[PDB]
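Input for the complex:
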Amino acid sequence: ENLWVTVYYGVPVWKDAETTLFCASDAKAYDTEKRNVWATHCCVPTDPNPQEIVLENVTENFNMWKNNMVEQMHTDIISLWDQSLKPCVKLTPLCVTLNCTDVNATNEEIKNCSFNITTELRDKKKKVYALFYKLDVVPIDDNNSYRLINCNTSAITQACPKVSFEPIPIHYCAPAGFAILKCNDKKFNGTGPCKNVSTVQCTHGIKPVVSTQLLLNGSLAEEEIIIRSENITNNAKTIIVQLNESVEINCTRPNNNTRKSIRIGPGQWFYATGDIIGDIRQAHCNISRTKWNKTLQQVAKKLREHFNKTIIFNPSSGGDLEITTHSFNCGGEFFYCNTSELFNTNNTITLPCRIKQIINMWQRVGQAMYAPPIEGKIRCTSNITGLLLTRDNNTETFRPGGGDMRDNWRSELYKYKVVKIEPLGVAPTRCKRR
Amino acid sequence: FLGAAGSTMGAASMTLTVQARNLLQLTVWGIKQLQARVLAVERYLKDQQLLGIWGCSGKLICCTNVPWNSSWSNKSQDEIWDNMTWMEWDKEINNYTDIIYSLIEESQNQQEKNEQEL
Amino acid sequence: FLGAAGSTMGAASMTLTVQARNLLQLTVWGIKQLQARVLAVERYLKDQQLLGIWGCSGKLICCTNVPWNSSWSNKSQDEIWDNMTWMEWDKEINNYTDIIYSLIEESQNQQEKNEQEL
Amino acid sequence: FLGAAGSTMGAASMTLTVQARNLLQLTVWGIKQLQARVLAVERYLKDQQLLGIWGCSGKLICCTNVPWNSSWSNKSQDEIWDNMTWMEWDKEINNYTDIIYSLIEESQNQQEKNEQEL
Ligand SMILES: *[C@@H]1O[C@H](CO)[C@@H](O[C@@H]2O[C@H](CO)[C@@H](O[C@@H]3O[C@H](CO[C@H]4O[C@H](CO[C@H]5O[C@H](CO)[C@@H](O)[C@H](O)[C@@H]5O)[C@@H](O)[C@H](O)[C@@H]4O)[C@@H](O)[C@H](O[C@H]4O[C@H](CO)[C@@H](O)[C@H](O)[C@@H]4O[C@H]4O[C@H](CO)[C@@H](O)[C@H](O)[C@@H]4O)[C@@H]3O)[C@H](O)[C@H]2NC(C)=O)[C@H](O)[C@H]1NC(C)=O
Ligand SMILES: *[C@@H]1O[C@H](CO)[C@@H](O[C@@H]2O[C@H](CO)[C@@H](O[C@@H]3O[C@H](CO[C@H]4O[C@H](CO)[C@@H](O)[C@H](O)[C@@H]4O)[C@@H](O)[C@H](O)[C@@H]3O)[C@H](O)[C@H]2NC(C)=O)[C@H](O)[C@H]1NC(C)=O
Ligand SMILES: *[C@@H]1O[C@H](CO)[C@@H](O[C@@H]2O[C@H](CO)[C@@H](O[C@@H]3O[C@H](CO)[C@@H](O)[C@H](O)[C@@H]3O)[C@H](O)[C@H]2NC(C)=O)[C@H](O)[C@H]1NC(C)=O
Ligand SMILES: *[C@@H]1O[C@H](CO)[C@@H](O[C@@H]2O[C@H](CO)[C@@H](O[C@@H]3O[C@H](CO)[C@@H](O)[C@H](O)[C@@H]3O)[C@H](O)[C@H]2NC(C)=O)[C@H](O)[C@H]1NC(C)=O
Ligand SMILES: *[C@@H]1O[C@H](CO)[C@@H](O[C@@H]2O[C@H](CO)[C@@H](O)[C@H](O)[C@H]2NC(C)=O)[C@H](O)[C@H]1NC(C)=O
Ligand SMILES: *[C@@H]1O[C@H](CO)[C@@H](O[C@@H]2O[C@H](CO)[C@@H](O)[C@H](O)[C@H]2NC(C)=O)[C@H](O)[C@H]1NC(C)=O
Ligand SMILES: *[C@@H]1O[C@H](CO)[C@@H](O[C@@H]2O[C@H](CO)[C@@H](O)[C@H](O)[C@H]2NC(C)=O)[C@H](O)[C@H]1NC(C)=O
Ligand SMILES: *[C@@H]1O[C@H](CO)[C@@H](O[C@@H]2O[C@H](CO)[C@@H](O)[C@H](O)[C@H]2NC(C)=O)[C@H](O)[C@H]1NC(C)=O
Ligand SMILES: *[C@@H]1O[C@H](CO)[C@@H](O[C@@H]2O[C@H](CO)[C@@H](O)[C@H](O)[C@H]2NC(C)=O)[C@H](O)[C@H]1NC(C)=O
Ligand SMILES: *[C@@H]1O[C@H](CO)[C@@H](O[C@@H]2O[C@H](CO)[C@@H](O)[C@H](O)[C@H]2NC(C)=O)[C@H](O)[C@H]1NC(C)=O
Ligand SMILES: *[C@@H]1O[C@H](CO)[C@@H](O[C@@H]2O[C@H](CO)[C@@H](O)[C@H](O)[C@H]2NC(C)=O)[C@H](O)[C@H]1NC(C)=O
Ligand SMILES: *[C@@H]1O[C@H](CO)[C@@H](O[C@@H]2O[C@H](CO)[C@@H](O)[C@H](O)[C@H]2NC(C)=O)[C@H](O)[C@H]1NC(C)=O
Ligand SMILES: *[C@@H]1O[C@H](CO)[C@@H](O[C@@H]2O[C@H](CO)[C@@H](O)[C@H](O)[C@H]2NC(C)=O)[C@H](O)[C@H]1NC(C)=O
Ligand SMILES: *[C@@H]1O[C@H](CO)[C@@H](O[C@@H]2O[C@H](CO)[C@@H](O)[C@H](O)[C@H]2NC(C)=O)[C@H](O)[C@H]1NC(C)=O
Ligand SMILES: *[C@@H]1O[C@H](CO)[C@@H](O)[C@H](O)[C@H]1NC(C)=O
Ligand SMILES: *[C@@H]1O[C@H](CO)[C@@H](O)[C@H](O)[C@H]1NC(C)=O
Ligand SMILES: *[C@@H]1O[C@H](CO)[C@@H](O)[C@H](O)[C@H]1NC(C)=O
Ligand SMILES: *[C@@H]1O[C@H](CO)[C@@H](O)[C@H](O)[C@H]1NC(C)=O
Ligand SMILES: *[C@@H]1O[C@H](CO)[C@@H](O)[C@H](O)[C@H]1NC(C)=O
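Predicted:
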């Protein structure tokens, strides 16, 4: 029992920690001409053969709701968008009274407007035309006098015409002294001890896909639909449902669009929607009815395990398109699709969609962005991998959620935790210094 | 790395070398990365300084003076170095770090260096 | 500094103190300089950490265990420390550095610390 | 900290632990603070490097070779370690620091390490 203090260094223990993770990208497939916003060309390539180490006999407690990786990812995404939009041309010179008539959507939603704009020499103005979607144009008068929708609240910035916003899976890696732990429990919900925990050099890549009511292009649950909620009895919480099978969604912009490049100053270019070629058609999304119903039958079945009540689904209740519709980006275009036929035979469900160009991202009102037109037609294929639901008796009512973008990454980052290494400690020995 | 995290503290001593070894644009993103480099260095040095003052600078395992208390641990060495793991040990002895470090740092540095000069 | 760079490796062992000693606005220009300072520190520390794990922390010349291979060198020590220079030596053993370092880090850290506690 | 700053140099040898121990947004305010942290690290390391080259890395008090000059000090150890304080001592030996450091670095480094290999 002649036990003396021994100092140990390199002791394999850790504590929960909040630190800064760094960007890593496995793909270096893209060049520097494509200019993807996530192609930072500042961040390190990943290790093509990363090492995952299983920690036997450990029981790490995970918590997706208090996870700080979600907030960090959120902040960095906002930052990258502002950094890439900042240097481009402002559209504040277009905040003028618009003279508008309808396009020949004749025998609706596209307006043909004229402007008086400043040319490179300040004493001269030119009369120009552009087409606009109704959602971006607000009547001023009872006469045909309109304004751009956000000129009465803030500046509008044009998105850079050469910057791509197509998601690239981004890996989040820890700095030296830190480690990322992950849970490998197939039935694991948002919180609790994980009996199978491994340590990784870093996370897999997560694509920064933006969506609202439906979660697109994410990962799947391995065995069953897993429903994760911070507080399952609190109707105000978002319920995140991860599917164990994907559903394909086919979206398109059937019109052949054109682009008009308009000078609005000395190197200040504006990209206007040009003429419409061919038929005027409505944008839409295609979801197979049978896959949709099968999926929803299983979602209710699993939800019933928590409520023991009849479960029904209803359409979104109201509010701005950003909340009431399935808002997503595809190909650089911004779609707002109706989901009333989903949340409510053997055909395909066709959802009408609306398109708008002036976007207030992440509820930051006053930071409006103008999305320039894309020429030609748009074809999108995406995977529905999950749902965001909220709740409103012997029957429970679920409705599409969304709005808060944090939930979209929380749904992927639930598997990871950040801890820091604390290599020093002491224990008794029979060895003393002398 | 951490392969022995759930293992016997004694056995885990064979990983101390790896556990120690891997400790080492003008944008917001860029400054955050520079901050990360700096804090990693500062954390490293604080541990090295402490090993330094304790007289354990050249060691991963350092035997010092100061006996064990029953108020710190009442277990035999047979549980401690055979049946218990480092995470579990840390769970119990975490409340005594501010006692033990101070006891080593003053007493075993000052008494020892004075005798060495003399 | 580097006066003996083209000289005999043996003779150059007498210049190690200088070679070791000289290792130590909100603008773009300013951040580049700060970044450079941090990186210099990291390089210094990495070498010190490695000497530390090898048990060579207090030495410029450190004798360790692990014998030489014929694949590493087929020259006698008489050629090596008399006619060869450090640049020439580096040219020959450059492809065995990872090998030698691994051999030292594990074998000579574990055998020595385990026996010292015992 | 500095409690013995005005006291006897000998007595102050018991306070070296604390004196040695407490040495460790994208705005201009933020960069200045980061620069300050980097400097503190650099200063710390320069002192450690010097103790290292002198063979004093593990010590707060390090006895070396090189006798004292009458040109450096003409006082006995009885005044120096009993009546004088560290501030007063620094006032007298301030002009000899470069001399002493140079002598130690070359002589006591290279002669000693060469003899040890041999
Ligand atoms: C969920 O995941 C899914 C699955 O990944 C995502 O779905 C993908 O989304 C992609 C982006 O929306 C989409 O990619 C576009 O596809 C268009 C049509 O594809 C046909 O033609 C390509 C030709 O490929 C070859 O040429 C390109 C040119 O760069 C090369 O890059 C390739 O390597 C090849 O050499 C075929 O490969 C396809 O099989 C089809 O036949 C393309 O036209 C489009 O390219 C243009 O836009 C790019 C945007 O970055 C740009 O980089 C590229 O250079 C092109 O733009 C130039 O040319 C046009 C021509 O008018 C010009 O106007 C521009 O100014 C510029 O000069 C993309 O390649 C994927 O096809 C799609 N996958 C599927 C199965 O549909 C889904 O988006 C994601 N969902 C969510 C919500 O995130
Ligand atoms: C949206 O509308 C656009 C404008 O009409 C469409 O572009 C047109 O697409 C047709 C496809 O048949 C092209 O016709 C072919 O042209 C090539 C020769 O092209 C080259 O020479 C022409 C001369 O004007 C030049 O304009 C082109 O840029 C090329 O240099 C012929 O060899 C073929 O036989 C055939 O005639 C049109 O030329 C093309 N017009 C333009 C201005 O590009 C666009 O395809 C439509 N998009 C969709 C999705 O429907
Ligand atoms: C998705 O598309 C559906 C229809 O396909 C939209 O539902 C329709 O919404 C309008 C809202 O004005 C309803 O009109 C109102 O109906 C009530 C009925 O009493 C009437 O009193 C009001 O004066 C007004 O006419 C319309 O009836 C309703 N259609 C159906 C079949 O219910 C839905 O709003 C679209 N959602 C999104 C997010 O775009
Ligand atoms: C939506 O989810 C489905 C099901 O996971 C996806 O289908 C799968 O897509 C991957 C793409 O890498 C296929 O992997 C590769 O397929 C090629 C085919 O020649 C094969 O040679 C490669 O070795 C590799 O297996 C995978 O097989 C395919 N699964 C099935 C059952 O076809 C679909 O792509 C997803 N859609 C979206 C928009 O992400
Ligand atoms: C615990 O999690 C680990 C992953 O960390 C699982 O190990 C993987 O198992 C699959 C099975 O095919 C192998 O292909 C992988 O190569 C294994 N990965 C590693 C890192 O070894 C393990 O099977 C899980 N165990 C349980 C009980 O779920
Ligand atoms: C622009 O404003 C004018 C009137 O302020 C709109 O009406 C036109 O007025 C001129 C006056 O000479 C008539 O010759 C045109 O025939 C009128 N147009 C129509 C359709 O009656 C004009 O429509 C407005 N619209 C645009 C896009 O310029
Ligand atoms: C700004 O737009 C207005 C229309 O909204 C232009 O006013 C018309 O200009 C034409 C030019 O000959 C006149 O014939 C019309 O009578 C004007 N309308 C009215 C109601 O008087 C105005 O000229 C444009 N400014 C510039 C610089 O083009
Ligand atoms: C300036 O913007 C504010 C909103 O910040 C406008 O107020 C609301 O605008 C919406 C747009 O559809 C209307 O539906 C609301 O009814 C408006 N509020 C009220 C109380 O009527 C405001 O009207 C905008 N200014 C102008 C001149 O349109
Ligand atoms: C998944 O959710 C279930 C609850 O539906 C968790 O079970 C525990 O339930 C009791 C009931 O009193 C709570 O007090 C516990 O706090 C719940 N556990 C947790 C971690 O909160 C189940 O444990 C959850 N998943 C995991 C991985 O444990
Ligand atoms: C979900 O949250 C609600 C409240 O947000 C919890 O239930 C209520 O908690 C408040 C706290 O002051 C009490 O005053 C109420 O009386 C509680 N409600 C009831 C019916 O007792 C609820 O327990 C949480 N549920 C889960 C699963 O975490
Ligand atoms: C979405 O688009 C894809 C691609 O065309 C459709 O996949 C095709 O489906 C038909 C149906 O029998 C198959 O014969 C084709 O071979 C499939 N093509 C490919 C490339 O797999 C998919 O069915 C569409 N989804 C919807 C809802 O219409
Ligand atoms: C997790 O605990 C198990 C059980 O103690 C460890 O398995 C033992 O490993 C030793 C190694 O010499 C064997 O002698 C025992 O016979 C094994 N026990 C059984 C029941 O097979 C396992 O190695 C531990 N893993 C970690 C990381 O500690
Ligand atoms: C470059 O090489 C020459 C000879 O190859 C070195 O000169 C020798 O220096 C030693 C010093 O004791 C003398 O004993 C030899 O006699 C000299 N050799 C000749 C041929 O004169 C010279 O010092 C070397 N310089 C460096 C930096 O290595
Ligand atoms: C300042 O100087 C005074 C005396 O000059 C110090 O006081 C002495 O403290 C020792 C402590 O053992 C006593 O034995 C002496 O008798 C004291 N001297 C007198 C005259 O009382 C005092 O401690 C010094 N303070 C510092 C910081 O050096
Ligand atoms: C999960 O996917 C598998 C795939 O075969 C399927 O058999 C299983 O029934 C699915 N479970 C749910 C709840 O969708
Ligand atoms: C959709 O909602 C309408 C509301 O009247 C209802 O009549 C219809 O049956 C619903 N469709 C489905 C598939 O539930
Ligand atoms: C144990 O802690 C008590 C607390 O007062 C202390 O007095 C005693 O000396 C300690 N024993 C050891 C071995 O440190
Ligand atoms: C020399 O290389 C051979 C090749 O495998 C190796 O087996 C042997 O142990 C090496 N000797 C030394 C000193 O490393
Ligand atoms: C004292 O200074 C003289 C000046 O030349 C020097 O020669 C002598 O060696 C020095 N003594 C010591 C102890 O360095």
